[PDB]
Short mmCIF file of N, CA and C and ligand atoms in Angstrom, two decimals:
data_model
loop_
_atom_site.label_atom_id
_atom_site.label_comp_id
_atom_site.label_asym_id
_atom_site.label_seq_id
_atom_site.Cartn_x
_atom_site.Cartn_y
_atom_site.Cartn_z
N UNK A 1 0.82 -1.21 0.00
CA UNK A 1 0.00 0.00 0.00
C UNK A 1 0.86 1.27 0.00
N UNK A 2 0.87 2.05 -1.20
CA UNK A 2 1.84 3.26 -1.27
C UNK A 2 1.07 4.59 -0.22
N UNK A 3 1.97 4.87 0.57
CA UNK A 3 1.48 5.67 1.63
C UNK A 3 0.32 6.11 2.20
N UNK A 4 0.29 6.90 0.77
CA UNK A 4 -0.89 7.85 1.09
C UNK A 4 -2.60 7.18 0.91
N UNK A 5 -2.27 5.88 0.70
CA UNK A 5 -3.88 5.20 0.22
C UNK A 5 -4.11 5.16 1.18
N UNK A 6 -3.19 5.27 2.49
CA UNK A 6 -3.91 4.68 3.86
C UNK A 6 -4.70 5.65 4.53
N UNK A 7 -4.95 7.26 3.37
CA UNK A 7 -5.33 8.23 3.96
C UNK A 7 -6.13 8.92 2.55
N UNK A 8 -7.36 9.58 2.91
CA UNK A 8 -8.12 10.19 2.36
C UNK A 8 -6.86 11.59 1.67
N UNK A 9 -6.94 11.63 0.60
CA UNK A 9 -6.08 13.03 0.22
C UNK A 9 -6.38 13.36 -0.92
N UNK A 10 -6.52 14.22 -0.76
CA UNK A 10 -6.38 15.36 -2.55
C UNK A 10 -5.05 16.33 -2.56
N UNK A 11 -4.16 15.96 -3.99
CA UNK A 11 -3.23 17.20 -4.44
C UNK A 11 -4.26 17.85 -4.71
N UNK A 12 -3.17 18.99 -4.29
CA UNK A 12 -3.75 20.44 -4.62
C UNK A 12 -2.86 20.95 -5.88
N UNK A 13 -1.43 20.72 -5.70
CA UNK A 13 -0.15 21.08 -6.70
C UNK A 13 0.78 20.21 -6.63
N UNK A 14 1.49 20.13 -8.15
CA UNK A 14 3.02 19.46 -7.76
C UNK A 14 3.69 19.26 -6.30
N UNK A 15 3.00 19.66 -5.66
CA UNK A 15 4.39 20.72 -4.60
C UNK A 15 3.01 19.76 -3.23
N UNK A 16 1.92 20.56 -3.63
CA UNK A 16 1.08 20.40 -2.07
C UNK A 16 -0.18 19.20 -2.18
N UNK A 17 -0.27 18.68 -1.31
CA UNK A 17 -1.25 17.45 -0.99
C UNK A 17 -2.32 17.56 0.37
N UNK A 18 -3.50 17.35 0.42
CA UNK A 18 -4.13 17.92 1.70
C UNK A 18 -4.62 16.27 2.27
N UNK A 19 -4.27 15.99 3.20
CA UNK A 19 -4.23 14.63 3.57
C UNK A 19 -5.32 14.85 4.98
N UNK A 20 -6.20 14.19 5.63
CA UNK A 20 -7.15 14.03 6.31
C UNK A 20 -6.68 12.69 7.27
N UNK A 21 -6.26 13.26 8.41
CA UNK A 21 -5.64 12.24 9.18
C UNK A 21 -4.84 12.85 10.25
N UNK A 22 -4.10 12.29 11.54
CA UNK A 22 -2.81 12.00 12.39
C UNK A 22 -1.75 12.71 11.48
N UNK A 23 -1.16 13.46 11.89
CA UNK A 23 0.30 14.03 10.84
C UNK A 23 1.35 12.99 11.46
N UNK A 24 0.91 12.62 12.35
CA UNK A 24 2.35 11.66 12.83
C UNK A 24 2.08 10.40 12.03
N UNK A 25 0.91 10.02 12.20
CA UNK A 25 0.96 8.70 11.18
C UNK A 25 1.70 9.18 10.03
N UNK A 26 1.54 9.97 9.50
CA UNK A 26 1.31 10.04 8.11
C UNK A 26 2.98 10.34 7.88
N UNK A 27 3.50 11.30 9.10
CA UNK A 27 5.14 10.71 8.96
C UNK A 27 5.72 9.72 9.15
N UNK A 28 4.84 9.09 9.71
CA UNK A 28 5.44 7.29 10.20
C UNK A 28 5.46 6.55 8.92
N UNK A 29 4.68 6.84 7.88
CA UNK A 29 4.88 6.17 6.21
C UNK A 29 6.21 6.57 5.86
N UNK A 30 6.83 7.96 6.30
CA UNK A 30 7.72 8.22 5.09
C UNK A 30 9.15 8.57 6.38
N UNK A 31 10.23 7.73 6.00
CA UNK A 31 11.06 7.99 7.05
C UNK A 31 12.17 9.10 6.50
N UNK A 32 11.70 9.85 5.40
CA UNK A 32 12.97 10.84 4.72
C UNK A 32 12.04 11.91 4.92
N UNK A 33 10.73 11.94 5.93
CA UNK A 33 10.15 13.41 6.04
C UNK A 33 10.50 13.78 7.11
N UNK A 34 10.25 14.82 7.15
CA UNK A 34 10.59 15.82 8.36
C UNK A 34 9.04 16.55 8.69
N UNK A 35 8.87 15.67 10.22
CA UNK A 35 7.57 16.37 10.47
C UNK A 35 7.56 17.49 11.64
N UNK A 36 6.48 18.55 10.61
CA UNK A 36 6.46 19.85 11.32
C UNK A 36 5.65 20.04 13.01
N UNK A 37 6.41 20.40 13.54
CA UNK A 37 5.99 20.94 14.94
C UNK A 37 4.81 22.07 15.34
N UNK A 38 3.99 22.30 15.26
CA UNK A 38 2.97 23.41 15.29
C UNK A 38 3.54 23.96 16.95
N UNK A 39 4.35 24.59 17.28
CA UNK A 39 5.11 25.16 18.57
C UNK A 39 4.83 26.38 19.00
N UNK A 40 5.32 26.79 20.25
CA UNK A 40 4.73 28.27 20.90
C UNK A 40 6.41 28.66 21.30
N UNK A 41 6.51 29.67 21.71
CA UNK A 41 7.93 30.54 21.81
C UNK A 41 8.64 29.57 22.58
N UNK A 42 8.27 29.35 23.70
CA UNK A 42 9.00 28.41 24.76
C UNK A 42 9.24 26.60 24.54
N UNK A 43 8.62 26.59 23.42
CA UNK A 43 8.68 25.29 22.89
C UNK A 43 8.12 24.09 24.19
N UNK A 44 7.33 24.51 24.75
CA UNK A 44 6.56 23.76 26.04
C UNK A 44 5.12 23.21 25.24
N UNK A 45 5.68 21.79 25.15
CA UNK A 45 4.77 20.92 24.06
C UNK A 45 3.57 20.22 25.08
N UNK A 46 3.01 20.88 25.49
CA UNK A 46 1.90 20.03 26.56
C UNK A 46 0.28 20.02 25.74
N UNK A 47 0.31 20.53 25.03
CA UNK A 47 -1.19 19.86 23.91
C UNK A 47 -1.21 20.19 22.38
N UNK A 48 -2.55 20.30 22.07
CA UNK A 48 -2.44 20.34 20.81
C UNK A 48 -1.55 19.32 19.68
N UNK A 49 -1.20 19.22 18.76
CA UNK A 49 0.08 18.35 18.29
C UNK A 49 1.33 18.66 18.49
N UNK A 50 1.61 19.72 19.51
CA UNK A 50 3.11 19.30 20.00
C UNK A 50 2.84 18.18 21.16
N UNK A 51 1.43 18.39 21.83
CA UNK A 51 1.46 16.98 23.05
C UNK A 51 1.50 15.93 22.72
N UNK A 52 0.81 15.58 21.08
CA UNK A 52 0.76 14.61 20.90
C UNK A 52 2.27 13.63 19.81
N UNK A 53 2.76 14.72 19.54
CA UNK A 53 4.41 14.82 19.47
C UNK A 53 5.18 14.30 20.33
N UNK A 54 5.21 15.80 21.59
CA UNK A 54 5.70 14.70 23.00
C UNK A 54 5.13 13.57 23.12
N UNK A 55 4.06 13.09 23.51
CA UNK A 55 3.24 11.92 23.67
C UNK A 55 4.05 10.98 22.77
N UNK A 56 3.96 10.65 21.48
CA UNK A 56 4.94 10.00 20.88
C UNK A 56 6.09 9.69 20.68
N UNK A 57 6.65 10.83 21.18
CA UNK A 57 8.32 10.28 21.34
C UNK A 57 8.46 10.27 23.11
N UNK A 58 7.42 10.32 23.88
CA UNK A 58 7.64 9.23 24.99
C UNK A 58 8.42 10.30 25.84
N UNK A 59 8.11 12.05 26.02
CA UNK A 59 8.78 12.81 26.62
C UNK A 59 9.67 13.27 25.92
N UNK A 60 10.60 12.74 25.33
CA UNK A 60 11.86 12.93 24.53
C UNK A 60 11.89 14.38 23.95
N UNK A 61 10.56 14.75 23.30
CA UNK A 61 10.69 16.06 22.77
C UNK A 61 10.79 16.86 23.57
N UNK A 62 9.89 16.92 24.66
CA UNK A 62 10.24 17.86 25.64
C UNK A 62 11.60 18.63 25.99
N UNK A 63 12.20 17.18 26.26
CA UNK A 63 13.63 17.37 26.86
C UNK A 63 14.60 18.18 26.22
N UNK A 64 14.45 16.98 24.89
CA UNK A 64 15.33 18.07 23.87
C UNK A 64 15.14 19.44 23.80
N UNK A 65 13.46 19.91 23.85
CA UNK A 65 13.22 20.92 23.78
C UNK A 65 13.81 22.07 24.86
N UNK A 66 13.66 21.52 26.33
CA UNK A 66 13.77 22.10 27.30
C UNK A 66 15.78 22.52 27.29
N UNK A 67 16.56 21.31 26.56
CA UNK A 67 17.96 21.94 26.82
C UNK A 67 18.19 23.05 25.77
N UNK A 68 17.45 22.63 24.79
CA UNK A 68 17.55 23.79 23.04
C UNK A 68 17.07 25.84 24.58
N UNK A 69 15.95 25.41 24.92
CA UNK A 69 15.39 26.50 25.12
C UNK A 69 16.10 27.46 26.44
N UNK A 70 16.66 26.50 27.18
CA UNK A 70 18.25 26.66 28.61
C UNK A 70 18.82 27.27 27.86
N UNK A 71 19.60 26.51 27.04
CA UNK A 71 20.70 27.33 25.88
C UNK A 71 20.46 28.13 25.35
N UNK A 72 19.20 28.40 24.43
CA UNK A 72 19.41 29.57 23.63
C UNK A 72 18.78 30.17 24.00
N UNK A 73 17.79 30.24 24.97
CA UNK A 73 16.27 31.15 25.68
C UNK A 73 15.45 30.87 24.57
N UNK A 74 13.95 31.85 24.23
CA UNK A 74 12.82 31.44 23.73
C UNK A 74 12.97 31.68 22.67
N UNK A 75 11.98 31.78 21.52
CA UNK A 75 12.23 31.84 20.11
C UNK A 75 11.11 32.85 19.84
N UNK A 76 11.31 33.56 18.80
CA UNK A 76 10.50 34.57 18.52
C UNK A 76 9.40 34.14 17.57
N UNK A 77 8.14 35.03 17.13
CA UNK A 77 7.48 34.68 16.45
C UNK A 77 8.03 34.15 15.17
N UNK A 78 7.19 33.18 14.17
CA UNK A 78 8.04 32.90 12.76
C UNK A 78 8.75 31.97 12.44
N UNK A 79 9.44 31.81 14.00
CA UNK A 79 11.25 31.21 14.22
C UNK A 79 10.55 29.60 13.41
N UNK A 80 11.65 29.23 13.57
CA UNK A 80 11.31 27.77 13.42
C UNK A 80 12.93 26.84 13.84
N UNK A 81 12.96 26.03 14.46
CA UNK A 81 14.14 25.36 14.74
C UNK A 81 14.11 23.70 14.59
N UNK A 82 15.29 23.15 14.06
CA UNK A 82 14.90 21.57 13.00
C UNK A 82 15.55 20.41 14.39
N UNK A 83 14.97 20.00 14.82
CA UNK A 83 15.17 19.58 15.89
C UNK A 83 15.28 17.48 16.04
N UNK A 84 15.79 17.23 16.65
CA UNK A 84 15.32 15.29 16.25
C UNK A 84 14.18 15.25 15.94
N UNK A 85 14.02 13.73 15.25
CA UNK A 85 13.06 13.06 15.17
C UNK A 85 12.53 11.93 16.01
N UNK A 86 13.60 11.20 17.19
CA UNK A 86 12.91 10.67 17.58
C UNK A 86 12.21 9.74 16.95
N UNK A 87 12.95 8.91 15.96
CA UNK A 87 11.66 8.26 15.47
C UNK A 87 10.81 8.28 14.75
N UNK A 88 9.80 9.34 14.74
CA UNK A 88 8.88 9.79 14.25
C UNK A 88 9.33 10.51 12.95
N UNK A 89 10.60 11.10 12.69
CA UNK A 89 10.71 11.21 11.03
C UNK A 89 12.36 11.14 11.15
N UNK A 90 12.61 11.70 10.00
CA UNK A 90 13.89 12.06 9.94
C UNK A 90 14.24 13.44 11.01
N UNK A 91 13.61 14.32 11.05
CA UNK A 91 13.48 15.46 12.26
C UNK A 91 12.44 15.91 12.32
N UNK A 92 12.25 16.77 13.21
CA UNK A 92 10.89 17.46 13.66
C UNK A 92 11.37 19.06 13.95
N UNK A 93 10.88 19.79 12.66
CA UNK A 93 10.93 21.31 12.79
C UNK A 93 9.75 22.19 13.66
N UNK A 94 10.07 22.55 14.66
CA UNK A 94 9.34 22.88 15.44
C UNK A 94 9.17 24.23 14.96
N UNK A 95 7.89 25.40 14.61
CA UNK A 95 7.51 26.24 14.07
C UNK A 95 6.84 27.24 14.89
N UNK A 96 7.02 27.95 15.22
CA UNK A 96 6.11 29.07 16.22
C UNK A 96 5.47 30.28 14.95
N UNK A 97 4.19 29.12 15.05
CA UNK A 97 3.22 30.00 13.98
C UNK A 97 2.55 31.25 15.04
N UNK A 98 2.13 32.44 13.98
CA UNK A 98 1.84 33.66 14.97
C UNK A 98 0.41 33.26 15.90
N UNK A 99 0.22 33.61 17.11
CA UNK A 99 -0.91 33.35 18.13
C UNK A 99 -1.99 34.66 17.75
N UNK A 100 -3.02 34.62 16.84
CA UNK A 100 -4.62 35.60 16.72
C UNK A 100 -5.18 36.09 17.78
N UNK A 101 -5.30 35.53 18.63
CA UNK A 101 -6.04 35.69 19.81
C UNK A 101 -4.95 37.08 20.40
N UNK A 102 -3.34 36.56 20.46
CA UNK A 102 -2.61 37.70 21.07
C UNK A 102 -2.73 38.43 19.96
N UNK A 103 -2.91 38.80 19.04
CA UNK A 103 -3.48 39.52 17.85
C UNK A 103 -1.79 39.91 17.69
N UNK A 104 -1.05 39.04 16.96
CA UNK A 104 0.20 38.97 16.57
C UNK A 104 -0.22 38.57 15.14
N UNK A 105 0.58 39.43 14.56
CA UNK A 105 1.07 39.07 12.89
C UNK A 105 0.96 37.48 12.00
N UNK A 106 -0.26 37.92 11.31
CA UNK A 106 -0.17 36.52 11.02
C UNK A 106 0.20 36.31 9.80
N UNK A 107 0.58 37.33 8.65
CA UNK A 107 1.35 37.20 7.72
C UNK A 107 2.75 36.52 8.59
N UNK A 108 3.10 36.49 9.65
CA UNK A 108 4.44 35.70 10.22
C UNK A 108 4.35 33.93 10.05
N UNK A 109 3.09 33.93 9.54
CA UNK A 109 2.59 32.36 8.62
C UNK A 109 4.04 32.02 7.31
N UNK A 110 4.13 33.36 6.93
CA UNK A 110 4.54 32.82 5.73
C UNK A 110 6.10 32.76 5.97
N UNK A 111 7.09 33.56 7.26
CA UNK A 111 7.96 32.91 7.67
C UNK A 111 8.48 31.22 8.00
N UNK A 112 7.20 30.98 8.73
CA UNK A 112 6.88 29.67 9.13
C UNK A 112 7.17 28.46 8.25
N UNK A 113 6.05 28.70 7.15
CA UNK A 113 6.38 27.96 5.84
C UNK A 113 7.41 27.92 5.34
N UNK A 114 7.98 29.11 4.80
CA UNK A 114 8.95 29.55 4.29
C UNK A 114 10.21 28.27 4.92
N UNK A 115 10.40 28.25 6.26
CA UNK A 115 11.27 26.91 6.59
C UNK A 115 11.03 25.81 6.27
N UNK A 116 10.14 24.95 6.10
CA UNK A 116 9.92 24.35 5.30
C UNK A 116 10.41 23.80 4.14
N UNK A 117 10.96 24.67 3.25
CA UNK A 117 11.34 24.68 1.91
C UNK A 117 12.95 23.79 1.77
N UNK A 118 13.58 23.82 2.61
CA UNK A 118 14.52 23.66 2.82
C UNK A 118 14.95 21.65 2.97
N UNK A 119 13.65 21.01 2.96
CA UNK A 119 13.46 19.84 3.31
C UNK A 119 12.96 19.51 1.97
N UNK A 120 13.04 18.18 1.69
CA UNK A 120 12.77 17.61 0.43
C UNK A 120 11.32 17.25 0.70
N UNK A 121 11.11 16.15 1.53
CA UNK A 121 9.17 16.34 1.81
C UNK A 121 9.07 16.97 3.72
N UNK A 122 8.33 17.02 3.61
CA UNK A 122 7.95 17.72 4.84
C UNK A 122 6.50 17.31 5.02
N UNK A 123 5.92 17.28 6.48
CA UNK A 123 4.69 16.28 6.46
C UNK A 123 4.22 17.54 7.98
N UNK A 124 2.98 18.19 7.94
CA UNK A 124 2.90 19.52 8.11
C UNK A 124 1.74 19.14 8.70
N UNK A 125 1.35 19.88 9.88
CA UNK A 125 -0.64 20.38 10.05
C UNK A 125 -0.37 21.91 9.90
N UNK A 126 -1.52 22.42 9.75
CA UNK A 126 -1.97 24.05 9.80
C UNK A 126 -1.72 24.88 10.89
N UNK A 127 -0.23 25.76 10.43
CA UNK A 127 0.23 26.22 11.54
C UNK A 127 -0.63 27.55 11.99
N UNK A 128 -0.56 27.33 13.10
CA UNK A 128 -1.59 28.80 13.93
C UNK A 128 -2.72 28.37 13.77
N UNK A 129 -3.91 26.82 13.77
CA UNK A 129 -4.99 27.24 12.56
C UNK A 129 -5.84 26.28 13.81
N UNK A 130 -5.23 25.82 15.51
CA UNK A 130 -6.54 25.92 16.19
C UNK A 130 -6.53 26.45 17.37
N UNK A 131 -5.88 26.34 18.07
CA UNK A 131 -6.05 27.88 19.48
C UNK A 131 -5.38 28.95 19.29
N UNK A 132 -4.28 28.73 18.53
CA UNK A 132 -3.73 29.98 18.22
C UNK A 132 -4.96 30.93 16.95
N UNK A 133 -6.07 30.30 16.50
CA UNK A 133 -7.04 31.09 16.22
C UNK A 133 -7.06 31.28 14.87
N UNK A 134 -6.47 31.04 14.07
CA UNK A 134 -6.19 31.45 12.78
C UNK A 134 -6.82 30.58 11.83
N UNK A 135 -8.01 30.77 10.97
CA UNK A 135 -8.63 29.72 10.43
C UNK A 135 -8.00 28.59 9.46
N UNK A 136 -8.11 27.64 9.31
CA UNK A 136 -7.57 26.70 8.44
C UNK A 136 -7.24 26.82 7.24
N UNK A 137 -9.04 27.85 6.64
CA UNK A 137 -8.10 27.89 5.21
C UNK A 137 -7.03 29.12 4.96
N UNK A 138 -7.10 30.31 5.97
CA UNK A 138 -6.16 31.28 6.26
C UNK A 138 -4.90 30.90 6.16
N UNK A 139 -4.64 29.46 7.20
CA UNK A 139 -3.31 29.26 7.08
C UNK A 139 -3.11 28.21 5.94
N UNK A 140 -3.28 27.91 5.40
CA UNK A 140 -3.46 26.76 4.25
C UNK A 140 -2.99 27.75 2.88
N UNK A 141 -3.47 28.89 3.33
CA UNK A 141 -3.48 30.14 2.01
C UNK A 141 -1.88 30.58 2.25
N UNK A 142 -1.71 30.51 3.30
CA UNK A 142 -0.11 30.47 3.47
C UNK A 142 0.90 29.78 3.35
N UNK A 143 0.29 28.39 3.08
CA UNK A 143 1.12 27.49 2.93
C UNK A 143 1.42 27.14 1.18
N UNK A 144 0.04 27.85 1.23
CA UNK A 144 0.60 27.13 -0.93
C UNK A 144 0.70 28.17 -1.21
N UNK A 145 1.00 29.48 -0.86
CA UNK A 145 2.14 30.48 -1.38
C UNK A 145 3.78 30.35 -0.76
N UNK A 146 3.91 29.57 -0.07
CA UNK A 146 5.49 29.41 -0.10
C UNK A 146 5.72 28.10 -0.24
N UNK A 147 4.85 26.99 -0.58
CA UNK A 147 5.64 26.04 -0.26
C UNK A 147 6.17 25.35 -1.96
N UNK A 148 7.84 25.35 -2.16
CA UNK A 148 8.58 24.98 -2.84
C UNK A 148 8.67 23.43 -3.12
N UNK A 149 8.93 22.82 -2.06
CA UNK A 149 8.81 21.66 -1.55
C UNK A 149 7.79 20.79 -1.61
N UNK A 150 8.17 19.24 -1.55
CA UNK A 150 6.75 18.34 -1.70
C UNK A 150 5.87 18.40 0.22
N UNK A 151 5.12 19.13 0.25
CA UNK A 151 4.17 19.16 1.53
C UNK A 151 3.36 18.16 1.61
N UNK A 152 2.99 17.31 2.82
CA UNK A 152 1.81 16.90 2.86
C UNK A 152 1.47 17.40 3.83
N UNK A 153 0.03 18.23 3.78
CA UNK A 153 -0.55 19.12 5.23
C UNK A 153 -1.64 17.92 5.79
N UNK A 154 -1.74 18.17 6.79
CA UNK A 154 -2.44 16.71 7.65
C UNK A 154 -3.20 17.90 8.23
N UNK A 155 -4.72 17.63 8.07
CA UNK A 155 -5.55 18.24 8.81
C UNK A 155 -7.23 16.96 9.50
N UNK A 156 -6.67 16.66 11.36
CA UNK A 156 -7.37 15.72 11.33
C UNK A 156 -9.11 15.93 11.99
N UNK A 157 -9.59 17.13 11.49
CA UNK A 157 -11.18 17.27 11.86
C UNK A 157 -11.16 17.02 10.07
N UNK A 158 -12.23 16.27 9.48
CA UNK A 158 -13.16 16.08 8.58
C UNK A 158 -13.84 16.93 8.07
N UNK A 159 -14.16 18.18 9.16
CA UNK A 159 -14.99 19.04 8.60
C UNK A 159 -13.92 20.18 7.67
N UNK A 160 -12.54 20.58 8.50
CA UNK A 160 -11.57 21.63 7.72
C UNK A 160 -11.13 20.74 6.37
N UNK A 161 -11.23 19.09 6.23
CA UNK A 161 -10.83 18.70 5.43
C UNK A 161 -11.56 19.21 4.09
N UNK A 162 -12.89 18.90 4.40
CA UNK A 162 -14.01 19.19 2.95
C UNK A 162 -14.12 20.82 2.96
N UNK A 163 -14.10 21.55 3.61
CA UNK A 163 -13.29 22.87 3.31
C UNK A 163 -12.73 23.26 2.18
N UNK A 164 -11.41 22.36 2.76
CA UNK A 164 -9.97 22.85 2.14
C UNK A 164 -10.27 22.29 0.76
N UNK A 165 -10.63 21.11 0.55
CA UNK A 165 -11.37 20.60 -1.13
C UNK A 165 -12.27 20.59 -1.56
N UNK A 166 -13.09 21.97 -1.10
CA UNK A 166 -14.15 22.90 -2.26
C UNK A 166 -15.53 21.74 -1.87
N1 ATP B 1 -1.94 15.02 15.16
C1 ATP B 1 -2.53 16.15 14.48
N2 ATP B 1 -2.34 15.90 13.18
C2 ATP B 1 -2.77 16.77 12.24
N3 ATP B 1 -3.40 17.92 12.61
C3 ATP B 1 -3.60 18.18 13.93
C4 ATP B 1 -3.18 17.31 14.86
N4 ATP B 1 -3.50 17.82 16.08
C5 ATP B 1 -4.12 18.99 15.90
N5 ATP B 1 -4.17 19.21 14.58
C6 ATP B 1 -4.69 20.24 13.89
O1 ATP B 1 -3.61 21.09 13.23
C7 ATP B 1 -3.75 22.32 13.63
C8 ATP B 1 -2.57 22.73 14.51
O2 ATP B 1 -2.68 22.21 15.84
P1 ATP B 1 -2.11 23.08 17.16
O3 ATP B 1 -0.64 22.75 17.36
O4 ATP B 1 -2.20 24.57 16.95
O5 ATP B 1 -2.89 22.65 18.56
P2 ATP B 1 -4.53 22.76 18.74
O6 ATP B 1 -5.03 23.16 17.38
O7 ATP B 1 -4.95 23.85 19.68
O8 ATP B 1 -5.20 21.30 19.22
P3 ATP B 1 -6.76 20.82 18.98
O9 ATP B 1 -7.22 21.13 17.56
O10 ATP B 1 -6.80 19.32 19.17
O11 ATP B 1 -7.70 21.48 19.97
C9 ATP B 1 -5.20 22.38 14.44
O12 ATP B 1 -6.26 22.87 13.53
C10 ATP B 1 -5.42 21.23 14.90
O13 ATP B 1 -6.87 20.84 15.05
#
């Protein structure tokens, strides 16, 4: 079974694919991706899919996270830092998409992405796009203006899925 059958998906472009599912599964198919981190400044992964990140690598991210964040202090909006994988891919780029609610810059989406590019596939959810407030297809609109690279965006409510494919 070639990867992606194991998951509902529509390309969108050469480049982007909108996959309906777990983003971690969906990096667990491909061990040359690098799956994206949806992260906050302090890189303190306790829900959302960084918990379930931590949760999967069994604490591990945390840790790593916690000596990255000792050492260098916090990360600014945008930032993004390429961090282990743990397993779960080849690495895990942790992304501090902008927070709506703190009514921070959310063109700082397209920083976000923008790292990304740099990876041959990359296996992604919608950064900023559920407590940080920023609607799905908002950030989705950000993602297929920078993304260079083969993306697969993992979005796992059903309802943002039929959304995102009209
Ligand atoms: N394992 C996951 N895989 C793919 N997408 C996810 C996953 N977990 C959450 N998402 C979705 O991707 C987007 C980014 O998640 P984020 O890191 O901002 O935490 P969250 O959205 O507040 O968590 P939740 O949606 O469960 O309340 C959200 O729209 C979210 O619903």
């Amino acid at each position: 079974h070639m990867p992606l059958s194991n998951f509902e998906h529509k390309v969108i472009t050469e480049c982007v694919t909108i996959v309906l599912g777990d983003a971690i599964q969906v990096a667990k198919c491909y061990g040359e991706s690098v799956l994206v981190n949806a992260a906050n400044t302090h890189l303190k992964h306790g829900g959302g899919i960084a918990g379930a990140i931590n949760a999967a690598s069994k604490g591990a991210v945390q840790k790593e996270s916690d000596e990255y964040i000792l050492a260098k202090g916090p990360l600014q909006v945008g930032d993004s830092v390429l961090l282990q994988g743990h397993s779960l891919a080849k690495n895990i780029l942790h992304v501090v998409g902008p927070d709506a609610r703190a009514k921070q810059d959310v063109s700082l989406l397209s920083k976000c992405y923008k790292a990304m590019n740099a990876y041959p596939l990359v296996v992604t959810p919608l950064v900023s796009a559920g407590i940080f407030g920023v609607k799905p297809a908002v950030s989705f609109d950000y993602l297929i203006r920078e993304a260079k690279t083969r993306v697969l965006v993992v979005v796992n409510s059903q309802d943002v899925y039929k959304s995102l494919t009209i």
